Amino acid sequence: VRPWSEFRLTPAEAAAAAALAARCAQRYDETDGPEFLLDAPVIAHELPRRLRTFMARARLDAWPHALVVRGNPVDDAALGSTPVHWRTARTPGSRPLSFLLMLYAGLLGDVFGWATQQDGRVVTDVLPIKGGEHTLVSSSSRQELGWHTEDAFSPYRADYVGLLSLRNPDGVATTLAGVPLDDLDERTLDVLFQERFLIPEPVAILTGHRAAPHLRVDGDFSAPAEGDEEAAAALGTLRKLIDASLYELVLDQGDVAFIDNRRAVHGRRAFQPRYDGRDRWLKRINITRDLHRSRKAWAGDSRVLGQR
Template identity: 35%
Template sequence: MSTCPAPVRPLDASTAEELTIAAAKLLADHGSATSPELLAALPEASARLAETLGHALRPVDTADGLFVLRGLHLDDSEIGPTPAHWSTVGDSGALWDVVLLLVSALMGTPIAWDGQQDGRFVHNIVPSPGHENEQTGASSDVLLTPHTEDAFHPGRAHLLLLACMRNHDDIATTAASIRLTRLADEDVEELGRSVVPILPDDAYELARQFAGPPAPVPTLFDSGEGLTLRFDPAYTPREEADEAWRAAYGRLEDELARVSVAVSLRPGDVLVVDNDLVVHGRVPFQARYDGTDRWLKRASVRVEDRPTRPSAERGEHGYGQAALTAWAA
């Protein structure tokens, strides 16, 4: 068995069980993982788990900007077939939605988007017929280009959580940290300028209806604790930029490719990615479309008062915070 190229934080059997039992109880009490009452009960429920889980769920603390939480037990025969599309998931694997929400609540505040996957706090990532070549999580045939999640939005997640339900073909998520790259000072300076915008991705039904052209944003930001980035080449109109910026952007892409790791998640794994340090993607694969496809669940988390972004972002215009629903902790 190959070793994991990301730091693994193991959960012992009793801690894993405690988390699963807490999730099952919440689900039994509220009937559905999308129940507003269940969301409202999360802070208290997660606080009760803090003593045992707090250490494993401490902030990302290495330059590679990610970790894998491993040790949760998932029985393939209990989660039902992989849905063909996020919209037909219903309550499939709902226990894992709640597990992911509890982990999210221990690390920060889960957020959702009105225009994405029906406003659900936990998204389902499955390959879907007709979407094979898109730059969204529903694709398969193409490389999902390394990106910052929701890069276009000033309210984007600080942490991205991916829970693995099924991955029979060991299809890897890719991850590359800006903190592992080597860039010339001139390139860092060039990419700190606001030159071009980042456009909303195809997964947002509503985003394209917002009025006005989006503002140019910096790609790199020196937080004082090190570099952070906001990067989504598939949605960046780089042809609008000058030659010097384009060349620096190309060197950043090359460096990210050089330091990129491929993490093949196993069922029950939860990958936690720092969305300010790390760009993630996915290798191409052949979808099965027979109910046994790769299946991930995804949550987005805000961690307030992080010094990882330029403060000007707060006033950034273009796409309103109306698209964002934060459940208030």
């Protein structure tokens, strides 16, 4: 078996989806414009029916850590070289695939971005940046990107994180782990459900159903409340259990994954960057089931969050 739910497009389905994305790229100026933001969820209804059925049904299954869609064609010649920085990463070659990711995303919920992250962009970029190999951000490489809940610090964090692989020639693995429910004892579990952790006022790591908890943790940034040694020991145990159950998902060129940000943490294995124009490159997007949950952080009329 596999801990994620997987769908493979037929060449015909893939072609139709790509064709729809190209039409959108033709008619709208940008993915993040107010117009396409509002229309994309409706335009997505024109995607291949088998895909729409998968996305509607798989989202409601209780078990998977992510929804994975394989088989979108990507032409390296048409795509062009991997950008050196996210600033200049909205290349014409990657433009139709950015529109494609937002269409798929519209089947799962409401897309949004952060004012403090990549200039408030909704479709963002994951690529190695020279000089930043050993950082704690997605533009790292030689240092493994440790497992984490996306934007764990915030209550406005995404329900789903979407990743579309534009290229990944060396097969660098994304990492994933669910709640280690098969090994967490009930005392530790109880403590993880209490507001005794920092990620700043204290908050909980686990919430909701005890037989299927939601997760809010960051391998690097999580800490116990000052002096709380029971909270500390629970977090220590959780680290070692997550470290031991961490598994690999390789997003090959054209693969899209929608990681369940409440069920699973994720990261990326260390890799040696090339810096020759064909480095691993993903497009990325935050999705929430309910945009109104974060109405505090609404900058204004935009879909870009910014609290104080």
